Amino acid sequence: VAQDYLKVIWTAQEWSQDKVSTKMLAERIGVSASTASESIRKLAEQGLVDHGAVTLTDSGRRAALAMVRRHRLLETFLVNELGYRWDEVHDEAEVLEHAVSDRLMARIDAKLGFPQRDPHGDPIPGADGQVPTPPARQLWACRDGDTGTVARISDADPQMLRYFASIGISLDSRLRVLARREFAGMISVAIDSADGATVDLGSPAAQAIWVVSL
């Protein structure tokens, strides 16, 4: 699916500045690298990408921003109107993104009150194409003593979203790092809650929580 590639390339560049090899595309889009190379070759001919490493052109940016907007407004609509949880929305909107007309997103956007962020805090690009990215970094990238408000949680693993909800790490929850033990991949944080509990996040969980220091 050609549209999946532009959205994936853009989401990879959203919180990192590395490279998106054709092998990175294949394993996350979900198809063999044999066809991903044959795929990514096509979009470069259409003037959408360029590639070694792959990048977005200007026609690919406005096209990927469109795909991201539909995906993320659909996730939001499934939670706020249809009763999904935040771990059930990504697989649904991953399929619904290629069958929706601009008219439907307009009424979805209008009924949702024009939301700017996901159930995961993922920024929803505007129709004009601005993108409201919050100024955040991963919890694992922080150091001892730092505080912050959870602003965005990755949805690559629905189990991890389930784990976060069970202990009390939601969007807008305030954390402080107590003991970051780089060896061996453990970080202790204090959730600012009513009874004020304390949890021990492993290295992968902390690399999924983006936080805003304020």
113 binds a second copy (CB under 8 A): no
> Of 12, 44, 96, 186, which one interacts with a second copy (CB under 8 A)?
96
Minimum CB distance to Mn ion smaller for 98 or for 107 = 98
**Interacting stretch for a second copy, rule CB under 8 A, among 45-53, 80-88, 119-127, 179-187?**
80-88
Judged by beta carbon, residue 98 or residue 162, the one nearer a second copy is: 98
Q: Which is nearer to Mn ion, 87 or 118 (CB)?
A: 118
**Cβ 110 to a second copy, closest distance in Å?**
8
The Cα–Cα gap between 22 and 52 comes to 8
Residues binding a second copy: number (CB under 8 A): 18
Among a second copy, Mn ion, none, the one that 155 touches (CB under a kind-dependent 5 to 8 A) is Mn ion
DSSP, residue by residue, the chain:
-HHHHHHHHHHHTTS--S---HHHHHHHHTS-HHHHHHHHHHHHHTTSEE----EE-HHHHHHHHHHHHHHHHHHHHHHHTT---TTTHHHHHHHHTTS--HHHHHHHHHHTT---B-TT--B---SSS-------EESTTS-TT-EEEEEEE--S-HHHHHHHHHHT--TT-EEEEEEEETTTTEEEEEE--SS--EEEEEHHHHTTEEEE--
Residue 92 engages a second copy in binding (rule: CB under 8 A): yes
Q: Is 102 in the site for a second copy (CB under 8 A)?
A: no
Other residues' Cβ atoms within 10 Å of the Cβ of residue 178: 14
**Site mask, a second copy, residues 147-176, x = CB under 8 A?**
------------------------------
- Closest approach of Cβ 180 to a second copy, in Å? 39
Q: Which does 83 bind (CB under 5 to 8 A by kind): a second copy, Mn ion, none?
A: a second copy
**Interface residue list for a second copy (CB under 8 A):** 78, 81-84, 88, 92, 95-96, 98-101, 103-104, 107-108, 111
